[PDB]
Inverse folding.
RNA sequence: ACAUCCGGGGCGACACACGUGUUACAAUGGGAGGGACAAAGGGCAGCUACCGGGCGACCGGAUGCGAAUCUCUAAACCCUUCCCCAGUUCGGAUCGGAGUCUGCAACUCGACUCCGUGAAGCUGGAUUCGCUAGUAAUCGCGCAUCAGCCAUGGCGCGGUG
């Protein structure tokens, strides 16, 4: 996926649970971008 | 009947049709002042080609 | 870059003002607008002065002094550029029949010391004086 | 006033004649030239004779106003009721001059 | 006699023949005021004569080809400046002080492939 | 439209079939693939099954159809 | 039969969403009349001098040129005049009628011309992209493919700047 969020937030994971592993990665990105 | 309440300047006026040569005289509230007033498919195929 | 003297007055400030005024490279149109505006200016404020002198006085009146980057001094070239840009921009924003008429009205107002460009300059001066401690 | 239509009294002939249903800029210019009236004359400045000439040129040709409205409505009704491709496109409200939808109305 | 000179600017080329006289500037068998009905263009063409005070002292015949009005006027100005320098070599500093004798090499840049223009690029997104 | 110097475009075989039916006086259905053929006054009163890609849509030609192509009455796309 | 020939359809459908563009919303503008300036590139069934017909797209005679020789090439600009701030003399989508070409064939689905109709649109939020001088912006011209052309795309050229 790719959040719009002005500046892009792109991630990609390959597995059978990609829709959740990608969300884990993007949660890490969002916390790192918080401050 | 009631004098003053009724509209004044109820002169006799002439209506003249500019395109019908018709002149009428009345007492419209508007030596008569003059007001000017103005007042198939097979055939097409045979015509194109025949 | 080189700047050609104005054909009528032999000035570089006039050519710079026309350069600011020009749209899409139509310098003849911009020159016609400027000369027309000067004509209504001289026909309206007809004042023991000239036509170009009023325009120069208006630019000097609406020029700013310091700019908050904390406040700091302004270079002369940037001062002149911002004065010309402000005059043209508020002339465009204001209402009127033709651009020459709008520009003439704004030049006359700036000379007479009131107008939108003067209001912008006064607001910039207030915002500059607000931060005297950090300077 | 002219064909049952009141024109803008303060406009030139070649523009004010376009306010009649069935006459555009080209037809207005042609009508004025055929009637012999200068096209740069305001409507209020037309003489009685010039107005008569313009009206007579409008008649005998130039189907205008209610006649043109009825003709266009009849043509549309015939096209719809014949059940052709353009008829169903007009009945359903989609472009029928080759334009492609899915992107624009 | 005749003094020959040539000026160039963009796609315009001016060939100027200068001779003794008073004021006749003839462009392409046309008067100056009829070929260039603009005060700015006439001033551009007759700039070096006004700078060197040589106006009202010559006849000039100009042959212009190519370009637009501004390019042609600049080319004519350059040609007249070069002819004046040829006639009198002591006016070279005065003409250099205004730059009437410098050949401007600015020309239209070639359009590059993959772009709408020479430098403008497509909207990336 | 078609240039007036070339005349109308009418399928010769289809027209021959229609006039043969007219001469006979019988009524039937004429199956055709000539979607671009113009409808002539001789076509009025017959039934023409026009191909549309996968079937033959039957058209009963009336006087208001004269001058229209045969493919205007046999739509090729199905939408719902 | 996942091989092969043909005709007719489809790749052009639209509840809609995203991307890339073209026009506009006008006065630094839109019409009417007149005057002036380019460069590159193309041309044999092709470009066409010059006549005649048509409002026009075009058609019919005829001429030169396989072409630094003969042809195809300006608009923004300037001058005069009108419109005077309006959904208008802005805008030109949609639809109706009549035509011209190409092609065996223009219904689905072509380009152009002439009438008529004349919509949304009053400079656009969050957000976002390009560029740093003959550049951005704006104006026109030409070529590839090509019978014709959906070319507002691609590739180039010069004008004002």
């Amino acid at each position: 996926d790719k959040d719009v969020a002005r500046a892009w937030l792109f991630s990609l994971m390959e597995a059978g649970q990609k829709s959740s592993s990608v969300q884990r990665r993007l949660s890490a990105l969002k916390s790192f971008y918080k401050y | 009947m009631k004098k003053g309440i009724h509209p004044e300047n109820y002169r006799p006026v002439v209506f003249k049709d500019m395109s019908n040569e018709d002149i009428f005289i009345t007492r419209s509230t508007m030596t008569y002042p003059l007001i000017k007033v103005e007042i198939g498919r097979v055939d097409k195929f045979m015509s194109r080609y025949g | 870059r080189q700047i050609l003297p104005d054909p009528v007055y032999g000035d570089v400030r006039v050519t710079k003002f026309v350069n600011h005024l020009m749209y899409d490279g139509k310098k003849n149109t911009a020159f016609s607008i400027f000369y027309g505006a000067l004509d209504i200016v001289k026909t309206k404020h007809s004042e023991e002065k000239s036509a170009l002198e009023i325009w120069k006085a208006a630019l000097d009146n609406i020029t700013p002094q310091v700019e908050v980057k904390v406040p700091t001094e302004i270079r002369p070239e940037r001062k002149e550029s911002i004065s010309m840009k402000n005059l043209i921009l508020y002339a465009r924003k204001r209402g009127g029949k033709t651009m020459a008429d709008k520009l003439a009205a704004e030049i006359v107002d700036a000379f007479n010391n009131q107008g939108a460009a003067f209001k912008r300059k006064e607001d910039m001066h207030r915002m500059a004086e607000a931060n005297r401690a950090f300077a | 006033r002219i064909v049952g239509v009141d024109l803008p009294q303060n406009k030139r002939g070649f523009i004010a004649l376009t306010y009649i249903y069935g006459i555009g800029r080209s037809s207005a210019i042609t009508i004025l030239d055929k009637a012999g009236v200068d096209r740069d004359i305001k409507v209020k400045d037309w003489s009685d004779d010039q107005a008569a000439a313009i009206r007579d040129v409008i008649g005998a040709g130039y189907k205008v106003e209610g006649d043109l409205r009825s003709e266009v409505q009849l043509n549309i009704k015939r096209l719809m009721d014949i059940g052709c491709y353009r008829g169903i496109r007009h009945r359903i409200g989609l472009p029928l001059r080759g334009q492609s939808t899915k992107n624009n109305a | 006699d005749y003094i020959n000179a040539i000026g160039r600017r963009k796609a315009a080329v001016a060939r100027v023949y200068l001779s003794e006289g008073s004021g006749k500037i003839v462009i392409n068998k046309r008067e100056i005021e009829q070929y260039f009905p603009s005060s700015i263009l006439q001033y551009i063409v007759k700039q070096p004569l006004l700078k060197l005070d040589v106006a009202a002292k010559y006849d000039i015949k100009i042959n212009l080809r190519g370009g637009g009005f501004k390019g042609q006027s600049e080319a004519a100005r350059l040609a007249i400046a070069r002819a004046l320098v040829k006639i009198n070599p002591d006016d070279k500093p005065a003409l250099r002080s205004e730059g009437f004798i410098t050949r401007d090499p600015r020309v239209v840049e070639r359009k590059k492939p993959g772009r709408p223009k020479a430098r403008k690029r497509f909207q990336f997104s | 439209s078609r240039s007036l110097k070339k005349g109308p475009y009418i399928n010769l075989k289809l027209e021959k079939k229609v006039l043969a039916m007219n001469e006979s006086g019988k009524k039937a259905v004429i199956k055709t693939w000539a979607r671009a053929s113009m409808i002539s006054p001789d076509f009025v009163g017959h039934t023409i099954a026009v191909h549309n890609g996968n079937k033959f849509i039957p058209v009963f030609v009336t006087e208001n159809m004269v001058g229209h192509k045969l493919g205007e009455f046999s739509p090729t796309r199905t939408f719902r």
Summary: Residues 66-81 of chain D form the longest helix (16 residues).
